[PDB]
From a paper:
WW domains organize molecular assemblies by binding to short, proline rich peptide motifs each with ~4–6 residues. The type I WW domains bind to a consensus ‘PPxY’ motif (where P is proline, x is any amino acid and Y is tyrosine, also known as PY-motif) with very modest affinities (with Kd in the range of a few to a few tens of µM). To achieve this goal, we determined the high resolustion structures of 7 representative WW tandem/target complexes, and measured the binding constants of >100 WW domain tandems or isolated WW domains binding to known or previously unknown targets. In this study, we discovered that WW tandems, but not individual WW domains, can bind to target proteins with extremely high affinity and with very high sequence specificity.
Taken all above results together, we can deduce a consensus sequence motif for specific and strong bindings to the WW-tandems of KIBRA, MAGI2, and MAGI3 as: ‘ΦΦxYxxΨPxY’, where Φ is aliphatic or small polar amino acids and Ψ can be Pro, Cys, Ala, Ser, Thr or Val. We searched for proteins in the UniProtKB/Swiss-Prot database and identified 132 human proteins containing the ‘ΦΦxYxxΨPxY’ motifs. We selected 7 of such consensus sequences from six proteins (JCAD, USP6NL, β-Dystroglycan, PTPN21, ABLIM-1, and PTCH1) to measure their bindings to the KIBRA and MAGI3 WW tandems by ITC. Interestingly, β-Dystroglycan, a protein known to play critical roles in Hippo signaling-related cell adhesion and cell growth (Morikawa et al., 2017; Gawor and Prószyński, 2018), can also bind to KIBRA WW tandem with a high affinity (Kd ~96 nM). We solved the crystal structure of the KIBRA WW tandem in complex with the β-Dystroglycan PY34 peptide. The complex structure confirmed that the peptide binds to the KIBRA WW tandem following the mode exactly as we have predicted. Therefore, β-Dystroglycan may be a key regulator in cell growth and neuronal synaptic functions via specifically binding to KIBRA.
Residue numbers in the entry:
A (entry chain U): 879 to 895
B (entry chain A): 4 to 131
The structure:
């Protein structure tokens, strides 16, 4: 990987209806 | 007509427009379409040909270019994981070939130690 490697983006937080 | 989201699930869009999936029953979210688990191969072994297994994505970023996202391990990488997998399988068989060579070599040494011990037991015995 490079030094500016795009880090893992977790899915958005859970949110009720 | 498509297939429905399983019960308890909802689809939504992040700020950047990327689709994600909401599991209200377990109060979590996922980048992985819950219907993928019925279609996609589970591991790189089950793939044919170019398909990515469950929880893997292609992505792009102007800084880095094309890369791969693994939602299973929550990591990202540049290297094509299908290529990496084929490479890993060859390395493992190589490794097994090498430890077989080393095991054989060490047993040859043991065998020779044992014939030296036989000679010494012979000497000790023929001293009567």
């Amino acid at each position: 990987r490079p030094k500016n490697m795009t880090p893992y983006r977790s899915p958005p937080p859970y949110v009720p209806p | 007509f498509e297939l429905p989201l399983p019960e308890g699930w909802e689809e939504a869009r992040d700020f950047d427009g990327k689709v994600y999936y909401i599991d209200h029953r377990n109060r979590t979210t996922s980048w992985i379409d819950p219907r993928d688990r019925y279609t996609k191969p589970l591991t790189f072994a089950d793939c044919i040909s170019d398909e990515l297994p469950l929880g893997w994505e292609e992505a792009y970023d102007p800084q880095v270019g094309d890369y791969f996202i693994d939602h299973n391990t929550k990591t990202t990488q540049i290297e094509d994981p299908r290529v990496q997998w084929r490479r890993e399988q060859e390395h493992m068989l190589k490794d097994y070939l090498v430890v077989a060579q080393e095991a054989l070599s060490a047993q040859k040494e043991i065998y020779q130690v044992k014939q030296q011990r036989l000679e010494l037991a012979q000497q000790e015995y023929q001293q009567l």
